[PDB]
Protein backbone atom coordinates (compact mmCIF):
# COMPACT_ATOMS: atom_id res chain seq x y z
CA UNK A 1 0.00 0.00 0.00
CA UNK A 2 1.23 3.58 -0.87
CA UNK A 3 1.74 5.92 2.87
CA UNK A 4 -1.17 7.93 1.48
CA UNK A 5 -3.66 4.76 1.39
CA UNK A 6 -2.04 3.26 4.86
CA UNK A 7 -3.17 7.39 6.05
CA UNK A 8 -6.29 7.02 4.54
CA UNK A 9 -6.86 3.61 6.28
CA UNK A 10 -5.88 4.10 9.41
CA UNK A 11 -6.95 8.02 10.14
CA UNK A 12 -9.62 9.01 7.46
CA UNK A 13 -13.26 8.19 8.03
CA UNK A 14 -15.13 10.47 5.68
CA UNK A 15 -18.77 9.17 6.09
CA UNK A 16 -19.49 9.35 9.86
CA UNK A 17 -19.54 12.81 10.14
CA UNK A 18 -18.42 11.89 14.10
CA UNK A 19 -18.44 8.57 16.48
CA UNK A 20 -21.70 9.06 17.83
CA UNK A 21 -21.91 5.02 19.08
CA UNK A 22 -19.12 4.68 21.59
CA UNK A 23 -18.53 1.01 19.76
CA UNK A 24 -17.44 3.04 16.78
CA UNK A 25 -13.45 2.15 18.31
CA UNK A 26 -13.64 -1.49 18.46
CA UNK A 27 -15.33 -1.24 15.37
CA UNK A 28 -13.21 0.42 13.52
CA UNK A 29 -9.74 -0.50 14.59
CA UNK A 30 -10.84 -4.04 13.46
CA UNK A 31 -12.38 -2.68 10.03
CA UNK A 32 -9.14 -1.03 9.47
CA UNK A 33 -6.28 -3.98 9.81
CA UNK A 34 -4.96 -2.26 13.20
CA UNK A 35 -5.74 -5.26 15.52
CA UNK A 36 -4.57 -8.16 13.15
CA UNK A 37 -1.19 -8.84 14.73
CA UNK A 38 -1.33 -6.99 18.03
CA UNK A 39 -3.66 -4.01 20.18
CA UNK A 40 -2.55 -0.63 18.61
CA UNK A 41 -2.58 1.57 21.50
CA UNK A 42 -3.82 4.55 20.34
CA UNK A 43 -5.14 5.81 16.65
CA UNK A 44 -7.44 8.70 15.74
CA UNK A 45 -10.08 8.52 12.97
CA UNK A 46 -10.48 11.97 11.29
CA UNK A 47 -14.16 12.69 10.38
CA UNK A 48 -13.30 15.29 7.23
CA UNK A 49 -13.44 15.28 3.55
CA UNK A 50 -10.47 14.05 2.34
CA UNK A 51 -10.21 17.60 -0.04
CA UNK A 52 -10.04 19.12 4.00
CA UNK A 53 -7.74 16.96 5.55
CA UNK A 54 -5.14 16.39 2.55
CA UNK A 55 -5.23 20.59 2.22
CA UNK A 56 -3.08 20.49 5.55
CA UNK A 57 -0.67 20.03 4.01
CA UNK A 58 -0.24 23.78 2.93
CA UNK A 59 -1.36 25.24 6.03
CA UNK A 60 0.69 26.04 8.82
CA UNK A 61 4.21 24.14 9.24
CA UNK A 62 4.76 23.29 12.31
CA UNK A 63 8.03 20.69 13.96
CA UNK A 64 6.71 16.68 14.02
CA UNK A 65 7.16 15.36 17.36
CA UNK A 66 10.33 13.66 16.84
CA UNK A 67 11.88 16.60 15.68
CA UNK A 68 11.68 16.47 11.62
CA UNK A 69 9.86 19.75 10.52
CA UNK A 70 7.82 18.61 7.62
CA UNK A 71 4.82 18.42 9.66
CA UNK A 72 1.21 20.66 9.06
CA UNK A 73 -1.25 21.75 11.70
CA UNK A 74 -4.92 22.68 10.49
CA UNK A 75 -6.49 26.13 10.21
CA UNK A 76 -9.94 24.70 11.56
CA UNK A 77 -10.89 22.64 14.01
CA UNK A 78 -11.72 18.79 12.42
CA UNK A 79 -14.07 16.30 13.86
CA UNK A 80 -12.01 13.45 14.86
CA UNK A 81 -12.11 10.17 17.30
CA UNK A 82 -9.81 8.97 19.70
CA UNK A 83 -9.46 5.48 19.91
CA UNK A 84 -7.79 4.40 23.00
CA UNK A 85 -7.26 0.74 24.48
CA UNK A 86 -9.19 0.48 27.83
CA UNK A 87 -7.52 -0.56 31.05
CA UNK A 88 -9.67 -4.09 30.24
CA UNK A 89 -7.79 -5.21 26.51
CA UNK A 90 -5.18 -8.22 25.10
CA UNK A 91 -4.54 -9.22 22.04
CA UNK A 92 -7.18 -12.10 21.04
CA UNK A 93 -9.66 -9.61 21.47
CA UNK A 94 -8.87 -5.89 21.71
CA UNK A 95 -10.59 -3.60 23.31
CA UNK A 96 -11.21 0.29 22.65
CA UNK A 97 -12.62 3.79 24.21
CA UNK A 98 -14.22 6.06 22.06
CA UNK A 99 -13.88 9.66 22.49
CA UNK A 100 -15.36 12.09 19.58
CA UNK A 101 -13.57 15.37 19.77
CA UNK A 102 -12.83 18.50 17.77
CA UNK A 103 -9.55 19.28 17.56
CA UNK A 104 -6.60 20.89 14.72
CA UNK A 105 -4.78 17.74 13.60
CA UNK A 106 -1.60 17.42 12.62
CA UNK A 107 -0.09 15.26 9.86
CA UNK A 108 3.44 14.61 8.31
CA UNK A 109 3.24 15.37 4.37
CA UNK A 110 4.80 13.91 1.07
CA UNK A 111 4.78 13.46 -2.86
CA UNK A 112 3.12 14.42 -5.69
CA UNK A 113 0.12 15.06 -4.98
CA UNK A 114 1.13 16.44 -1.46
CA UNK A 115 0.14 14.64 0.99
CA UNK A 116 -0.77 13.41 4.42
CA UNK A 117 1.52 9.94 5.32
CA UNK A 118 1.83 10.06 9.26
CA UNK A 119 -0.72 10.95 11.87
CA UNK A 120 1.38 13.39 14.24
CA UNK A 121 -1.13 15.06 16.92
CA UNK A 122 -4.01 16.56 17.72
CA UNK A 123 -4.30 20.28 19.15
CA UNK B 1 -1.67 30.99 -3.61
CA UNK B 2 2.10 31.02 -2.78
CA UNK B 3 4.09 32.05 -5.29
CA UNK B 4 7.68 30.64 -5.57
CA UNK B 5 10.37 33.47 -7.12
CA UNK B 6 13.89 32.64 -8.18
CA UNK B 7 16.77 34.97 -9.57
CA UNK B 8 20.26 34.82 -10.15
CA UNK B 9 21.18 31.91 -12.38
CA UNK B 10 22.39 32.23 -16.06
CA UNK B 11 25.63 31.74 -18.12
CA UNK B 12 29.31 31.89 -16.15
CA UNK B 13 32.70 31.02 -16.98
CA UNK B 14 34.47 28.19 -15.09
CA UNK B 15 35.97 28.87 -11.63
CA UNK B 16 33.05 31.68 -11.60
CA UNK B 17 30.60 33.16 -9.23
CA UNK B 18 26.64 33.47 -9.16
CA UNK B 19 24.05 34.28 -6.71
CA UNK B 20 20.50 32.62 -6.60
CA UNK B 21 17.64 34.32 -4.92
CA UNK B 22 13.72 32.72 -3.76
CA UNK B 23 11.29 34.12 -1.99
CA UNK B 24 7.94 32.68 -0.99
CA UNK B 25 5.12 34.99 -0.90
CA UNK B 26 1.46 35.02 -0.21
CA UNK B 27 2.58 32.22 2.53
CA UNK B 28 0.82 33.37 6.34
CA UNK B 29 3.42 31.74 8.31
CA UNK B 30 7.26 30.73 7.93
CA UNK B 31 8.66 27.54 6.22
CA UNK B 32 10.94 26.12 8.94
CA UNK B 33 13.04 24.80 6.09
CA UNK B 34 14.05 26.15 3.01
CA UNK B 35 16.65 24.59 0.14
CA UNK B 36 18.18 24.13 -3.31
CA UNK B 37 18.08 21.28 -5.42
CA UNK B 38 19.19 20.77 -9.12
CA UNK B 39 18.86 18.31 -12.08
CA UNK B 40 21.08 18.60 -15.10
CA UNK B 41 20.09 16.91 -18.33
CA UNK B 42 19.72 12.46 -17.88
CA UNK B 43 21.10 12.65 -13.99
CA UNK B 44 18.88 12.36 -11.17
CA UNK B 45 17.45 15.35 -9.07
CA UNK B 46 19.66 15.86 -6.35
CA UNK B 47 20.03 17.67 -3.08
CA UNK B 48 22.13 21.03 -2.71
CA UNK B 49 21.87 22.95 0.36
CA UNK B 50 19.50 23.50 3.20
CA UNK B 51 19.29 25.87 5.86
CA UNK B 52 16.22 26.42 8.90
CA UNK B 53 14.42 29.32 9.68
CA UNK B 54 16.70 29.98 12.58
CA UNK B 55 19.46 29.91 10.44
CA UNK B 56 20.91 26.79 11.70
CA UNK B 57 20.37 22.86 10.52
CA UNK B 58 22.81 23.69 7.44
CA UNK B 59 23.46 20.76 5.24
CA UNK B 60 25.26 20.49 1.99
CA UNK B 61 26.06 17.88 -0.44
CA UNK B 62 28.95 16.51 -0.19
CA UNK B 63 30.29 17.32 -3.56
CA UNK B 64 29.64 21.13 -2.93
CA UNK B 65 30.42 21.94 0.68
CA UNK B 66 33.11 24.38 1.05
CA UNK B 67 32.52 26.07 -2.34
CA UNK B 68 28.25 27.04 -2.03
CA UNK B 69 26.74 28.76 0.71
CA UNK B 70 22.94 29.05 1.98
CA UNK B 71 22.21 31.55 3.87
CA UNK B 72 18.02 33.05 4.79
CA UNK B 73 16.90 36.09 6.47
CA UNK B 74 15.73 35.14 9.69
CA UNK B 75 12.13 34.20 10.15
CA UNK B 76 11.55 35.42 6.89
CA UNK B 77 10.42 33.22 4.21
CA UNK B 78 13.43 33.60 1.73
CA UNK B 79 16.89 31.67 0.53
CA UNK B 80 19.97 32.38 -1.08
CA UNK B 81 22.56 30.50 -2.76
CA UNK B 82 25.82 31.73 -3.46
CA UNK B 83 28.02 29.80 -5.40
CA UNK B 84 31.95 30.42 -6.23
CA UNK B 85 34.89 28.24 -7.40
CA UNK B 86 31.90 26.82 -10.06
CA UNK B 87 32.78 24.05 -12.19
CA UNK B 88 31.33 22.30 -15.33
CA UNK B 89 29.90 19.62 -13.10
CA UNK B 90 27.24 22.20 -11.08
CA UNK B 91 25.56 22.82 -14.53
CA UNK B 92 21.88 21.85 -14.11
CA UNK B 93 18.60 23.47 -13.26
CA UNK B 94 18.35 24.60 -9.60
CA UNK B 95 15.26 24.38 -7.74
CA UNK B 96 13.79 26.28 -4.87
CA UNK B 97 11.68 24.62 -2.18
CA UNK B 98 10.29 24.71 0.97
CA UNK B 99 8.22 23.40 3.75
CA UNK B 100 10.45 19.77 4.14
CA UNK B 101 13.04 18.29 6.13
CA UNK B 102 16.99 18.83 5.39
CA UNK B 103 18.03 17.17 1.71
CA UNK B 104 14.83 14.87 1.63
CA UNK B 105 13.56 15.29 -1.96
CA UNK B 106 9.34 14.00 -0.77
CA UNK B 107 9.14 16.29 2.13
CA UNK B 108 8.85 19.71 0.66
CA UNK B 109 5.49 20.35 -0.72
CA UNK B 110 6.75 23.90 -2.32
CA UNK B 111 8.79 24.22 -5.63
CA UNK B 112 10.09 27.23 -7.61
CA UNK B 113 10.10 26.74 -11.72
CA UNK B 114 13.86 26.54 -11.26
CA UNK B 115 16.34 28.57 -12.03
CA UNK B 116 19.07 27.25 -15.52
CA UNK B 117 22.67 27.98 -14.24
CA UNK B 118 25.23 26.90 -16.99
CA UNK B 119 28.88 26.44 -16.43
CA UNK B 120 31.21 26.37 -19.52
CA UNK B 121 35.09 24.74 -19.38
Known sequence: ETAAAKFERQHMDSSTSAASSSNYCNQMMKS??????????????????????????????????????????????????????????????????????????????????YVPVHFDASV | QVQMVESGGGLVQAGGSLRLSCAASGYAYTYIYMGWFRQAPGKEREGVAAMDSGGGGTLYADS???????????????????????????????????????????????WGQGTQVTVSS
Open chain 1, 32 to 113: RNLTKDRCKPVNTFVHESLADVQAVCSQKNVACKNGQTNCYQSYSTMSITDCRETGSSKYPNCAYKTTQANKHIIVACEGNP
Open chain 2, 64 to 110: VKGRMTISRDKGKNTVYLQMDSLKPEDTATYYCAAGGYELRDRTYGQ
